[PDB]
Design an enzyme around this catalytic site. Structure first.
Site, PDB file in Angstrom:
ATOM      1  N   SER A 155       1.228   6.616 -13.581  1.00  0.00           N
ATOM      2  CA  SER A 155       0.318   7.766 -13.412  1.00  0.00           C
ATOM      3  C   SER A 155      -1.042   7.440 -12.765  1.00  0.00           C
ATOM      4  CB  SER A 155       0.097   8.493 -14.746  1.00  0.00           C
ATOM      5  OG  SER A 155       1.306   9.081 -15.225  1.00  0.00           O
ATOM      6  N   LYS A 182      -1.885   9.369  -9.644  1.00  0.00           N
ATOM      7  CA  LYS A 182      -2.496  10.688  -9.773  1.00  0.00           C
ATOM      8  C   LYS A 182      -3.947  10.750  -9.272  1.00  0.00           C
ATOM      9  CE  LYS A 182       0.783  12.140 -13.282  1.00  0.00           C
ATOM     10  NZ  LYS A 182       1.232  11.909 -14.652  1.00  0.00           N
ATOM     11  N   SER A 219      -2.786  13.808 -17.579  1.00  0.00           N
ATOM     12  CA  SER A 219      -1.651  13.092 -16.972  1.00  0.00           C
ATOM     13  C   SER A 219      -0.382  13.967 -16.945  1.00  0.00           C
ATOM     14  CB  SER A 219      -1.371  11.747 -17.659  1.00  0.00           C
ATOM     15  OG  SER A 219      -0.792  10.832 -16.719  1.00  0.00           O
ATOM     16  N   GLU A 253       7.138  12.429 -10.239  1.00  0.00           N
ATOM     17  CA  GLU A 253       7.144  12.103 -11.671  1.00  0.00           C
ATOM     18  C   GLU A 253       8.352  12.808 -12.334  1.00  0.00           C
ATOM     19  OE1 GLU A 253       5.269   9.939 -13.166  1.00  0.00           O
ATOM     20  OE2 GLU A 253       3.175   9.930 -12.480  1.00  0.00           O
ATOM     21  N   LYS A 305      -8.302   6.609 -14.840  1.00  0.00           N
ATOM     22  CA  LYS A 305      -6.966   7.214 -14.904  1.00  0.00           C
ATOM     23  C   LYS A 305      -5.972   6.146 -15.374  1.00  0.00           C
ATOM     24  CE  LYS A 305      -3.627  10.156 -14.680  1.00  0.00           C
ATOM     25  NZ  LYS A 305      -3.106   9.357 -15.831  1.00  0.00           N
ATOM     26  N   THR A 306      -5.158   6.528 -16.348  1.00  0.00           N
ATOM     27  CA  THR A 306      -4.217   5.651 -17.018  1.00  0.00           C
ATOM     28  C   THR A 306      -2.829   5.800 -16.415  1.00  0.00           C
ATOM     29  OG1 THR A 306      -3.657   7.353 -18.684  1.00  0.00           O
ATOM     30  CG2 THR A 306      -5.474   5.853 -19.203  1.00  0.00           C
ATOM     31  N   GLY A 307      -1.943   4.878 -16.775  1.00  0.00           N
ATOM     32  CA  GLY A 307      -0.541   4.965 -16.382  1.00  0.00           C
ATOM     33  C   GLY A 307       0.311   4.207 -17.376  1.00  0.00           C
ATOM     34  N   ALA A 308       1.543   4.672 -17.550  1.00  0.00           N
ATOM     35  CA  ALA A 308       2.516   4.024 -18.396  1.00  0.00           C
ATOM     36  C   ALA A 308       3.859   4.122 -17.683  1.00  0.00           C
ATOM     37  CB  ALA A 308       2.571   4.699 -19.778  1.00  0.00           C
TER      38      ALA A 308
HETATM   39  O1  LIG Z   1      -1.196   7.201 -19.530  1.00  0.00           O
HETATM   40  C1  LIG Z   1      -0.516   8.051 -18.945  1.00  0.00           C
HETATM   41  O2  LIG Z   1      -0.878   8.527 -17.863  1.00  0.00           O
HETATM   42  C2  LIG Z   1       0.799   8.510 -19.561  1.00  0.00           C
HETATM   43  C3  LIG Z   1       0.646   9.357 -20.811  1.00  0.00           C
HETATM   44  O3  LIG Z   1       1.650   9.732 -21.415  1.00  0.00           O
HETATM   45  C4  LIG Z   1      -0.709   9.747 -21.351  1.00  0.00           C
HETATM   46  C5  LIG Z   1      -1.067   8.778 -22.461  1.00  0.00           C
HETATM   47  O4  LIG Z   1      -0.267   7.594 -22.332  1.00  0.00           O
END
Ligand SMILES: O=C(O)CC(=O)CCO
Length: 257
Positions: free
Chosen positions: A40, A43, A98, A134, A202-205
């Site tokens: 993510s 994004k 996200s 996604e 901005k995070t991602g998993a």
């Molecule tokens: O980090 C993300 O972008 C994915 C998510 O599910 C939000 C919290 O992990």
């Protein structure tokens, strides 16, 4: 660099780090050119490109979509199927929650993964390799380059849009403000910076326990630091631990101190 190695041992993960202090040009690097699924984090760069192409009033355009258009993780978009959402509202949901459908809708708006790639290539990012929407983009197998980037490339592309002249200032401020108000990174870069430091992230998993955070961070006084912290693990179904990223960030802050 030994501190990072020890985190890799403690959390049984590979770490990718690139940090740049824009006031001094001092860097902190660790496997900075190693590829990770971007997940993510993409994004942020997708919205950067959207802002390149759309005027502010363009963002008031309502986008409609169906139950069919919904994917796996739609915290905001699933609540507005009946009424649709404005591009500005979608950017909000994508960056701060996200929201995966929001990302997909924005991505269509800019011409899809290939257009995103072409746009990143134009700003000098020769590394980031978007191919999918996604949530499939989150699943990258070892050795693969599809939907990957590196710590250095992600940080540099984020810097391009947020801090440099790839966007005019009002659009920079817009992107920054959304990222400052991200809801998903409290345990990540935000937990690794000293009190009074400001964070836009901005995070991602993704698969293989991939857990990322990219950010611009502002000390109380002085210029922003750009930071990407990427991670992945050796098993497809691995769980990640956010503490890895918080601890990595602390090393970065100490090193720039
Ligand atoms: O980090 C993300 O972008 C994915 C998510 O599910 C939000 C919290 O992990």
């Amino acid at each position: 660099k030994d501190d990072f190695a020890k985190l890799e041992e403690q959390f049984d993960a590979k770490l990718g780090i690139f940090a740049l202090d824009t006031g001094t040009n001092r860097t902190v690097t660790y496997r900075p050119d190693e590829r990770f699924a971007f997940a993510s984090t993409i994004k942020a760069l997708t919205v950067g490109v959207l802002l390149q192409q759309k005027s502010i009033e363009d963002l008031n355009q309502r986008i409609t979509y169906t139950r069919d258009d919904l994917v796996n993780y739609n915290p905001i978009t699933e609540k507005h199927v009946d009424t649709g959402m404005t591009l500005k509202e979608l950017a909000d949901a994508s960056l701060r929650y996200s929201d995966n459908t929001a990302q997909n809708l924005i991505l269509k708006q800019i011409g899809g993964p290939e257009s995103l790639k072409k746009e990143l290539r134009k700003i000098g990012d020769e590394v980031t390799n978007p191919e999918r929407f996604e949530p499939e983009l989150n699943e990258v197998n070892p050795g693969e380059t599809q939907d990957t980037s590196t710590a250095r490339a992600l940080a540099t592309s984020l810097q391009a849009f947020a801090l440099e002249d790839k966007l005019p200032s009002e659009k920079r401020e817009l992107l920054i403000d959304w990222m400052k108000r991200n809801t998903t990174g409290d345990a990540l870069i935000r937990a690794g910076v000293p009190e009074g430091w400001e964070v836009a992230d901005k995070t991602g998993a993704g698969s293989y326990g991939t857990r990322n955070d990219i950010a611009i961070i502002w000390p109380p006084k002085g210029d922003p630091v750009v930071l990407a912290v990427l991670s992945s693990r050796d098993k497809k179904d691995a769980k990640y631990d956010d503490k890895l990223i918080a601890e990595a960030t602390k090393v970065v802050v100490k090193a720039l101190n």
